[PDB]
Amino acid sequence: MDPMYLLVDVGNTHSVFSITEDGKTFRRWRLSTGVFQTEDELFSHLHPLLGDAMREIKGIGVASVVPTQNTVIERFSQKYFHISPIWVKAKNGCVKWNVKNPSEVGADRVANVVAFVKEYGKNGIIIDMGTATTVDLVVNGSYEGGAILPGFFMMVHSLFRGTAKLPLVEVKPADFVVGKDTEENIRLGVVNGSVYALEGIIGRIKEVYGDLPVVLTGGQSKIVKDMIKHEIFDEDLTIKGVYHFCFG
Amino acid sequence: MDPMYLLVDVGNTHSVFSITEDGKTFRRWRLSTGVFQTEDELFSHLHPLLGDAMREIKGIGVASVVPTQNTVIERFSQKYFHISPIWVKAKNGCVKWNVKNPSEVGADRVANVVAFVKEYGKNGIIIDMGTATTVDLVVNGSYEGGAILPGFFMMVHSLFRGTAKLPLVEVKPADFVVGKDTEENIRLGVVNGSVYALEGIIGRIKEVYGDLPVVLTGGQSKIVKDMIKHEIFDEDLTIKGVYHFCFG
Ligand SMILES: CC(C)(CO)[C@@H](O)C(=O)NCCC(=O)O
Ligand SMILES: CC(C)(CO)[C@@H](O)C(=O)NCCC(=O)O
């Protein structure tokens, strides 16, 4: 048939919940991850969002980078659907994990790499702009490692909290060479600066491994889409990876 | 004669205290800026550092980017030396402050620009790697603005505090193209990445304003100085600016 699957991406700030019946088209919602949430709270939040679809869920797949939240997801799955979730984790098989300790790679990164190898090919560079911005390298189906940078909001917030004089600035690219006020200075340093950082890391990768395609994803990616050269834009990459890992 | 001046740079993290008798050579110490410090606490910390030099101080000049600390510095100056400090601020003179609100430019940046125009020339790009990393552009003795980036430690700390799984990583450049564990991923993204960000911003400035000399300074600059192209490395730049502004 076409059984419905619930896919979950538990991030540090937000958790994405998505339903699919084919692994190709997805309906998507986002909630704050939030401290001390319970399984009943999760159900209550999802109830008016999923509506009728709720009763059709046959399997639950989860990538999580917030271990304290995992018991809540497990309890929600068991209480409301009488099933245990399937947890995305690096394992041998379809991807070779050529790093020091694959078990420590974030589940969202694993999902991104799995989705890339299933849908796009054996060679690529994945940029995921979220709470942190990750760069992930896959070469001939081997995960090679990558980079982790603070995310855009994380950066503006760090400048605000970590100094006396700086305000909290809205994340918006600079369309000028030098900023002429404090907000412009920070936009240029954080937004354009982070794009330059990524271009530098990607450039050096390409020098060593050749000209790989770049996929861009993440909840913070849409605002800088025009600024970074990329061959694929796919906002659903992580959720696709959860689907492929858990439900093939 | 050669009156001794005390120069102070009050940063968000550290406060630099420096004495000079000629504005050419400087002895320096660094303390934490530390919350709720009093004038007597400051004297107590400085006493074994300055020793006999303390009694010789004829003037006190200060750049501060922590307004709450200013009353302590003022009271210290008045109580122990019966003088008021001279406060670095943007004003007309040797520098034209070509930005929207020059009164909002950080006093450390002001000091850097003043020092540059006094010692090095009328055209340059100043990179000051401190709590935040600042880029400052001076063209024909006109301050044109710049960029503000989170500093290196600010970045690694933000990743640690802002995520569940990431550790606090020591700031050390990456000598690899992709990281093969978490710590390596963070070093590449934060340290190498910030250098790339700076090179990008500098490069874009140079496209518009021409090939200007780059000066590096700041408490976090030494670790990365071999990674960034620069023509001048001067760790005393801010203190020099305090001296030039206050005492000529
Ligand atoms: C980097 C983040 C925070 C991105 O969400 C996450 O993938 C994570 O917690 N990773 C664990 C460390 C690693 O991937 O090396
Ligand atoms: C950017 C910092 C924090 C660097 O110390 C400082 O110069 C500052 O508080 N500046 C005020 C904002 C500005 O310079 O536009």
Swiss-Prot record, chains A, B:
Q: Name one GO molecular function term.
A: ATP binding
| Pathway(s) of this molecule | Cofactor biosynthesis; coenzyme A biosynthesis; CoA from (R)-pantothenate: step 1/5
Recorded catalytic activity of this chain's protein: (R)-pantothenate + ATP = (R)-4'-phosphopantothenate + ADP + H(+)
Give the GO terms filed under biological process for this record: coenzyme A biosynthetic process
The catalytic residues are 108
What does the record give as cofactor? Answer: NH4(+); K(+)
> Which residues of the sequence carry a binding annotation for ATP?
9-16, 131
Report quaternary structure and partners: Homodimer.
Q: What does this protein do?
A: Catalyzes the phosphorylation of pantothenate (Pan), the first step in CoA biosynthesis.
**What name does this protein carry?**
Type III pantothenate kinase
Organism of this sequence: Thermotoga maritima (strain ATCC 43589 / DSM 3109 / JCM 10099 / NBRC 100826 / MSB8)
The gene it comes from is: coaX
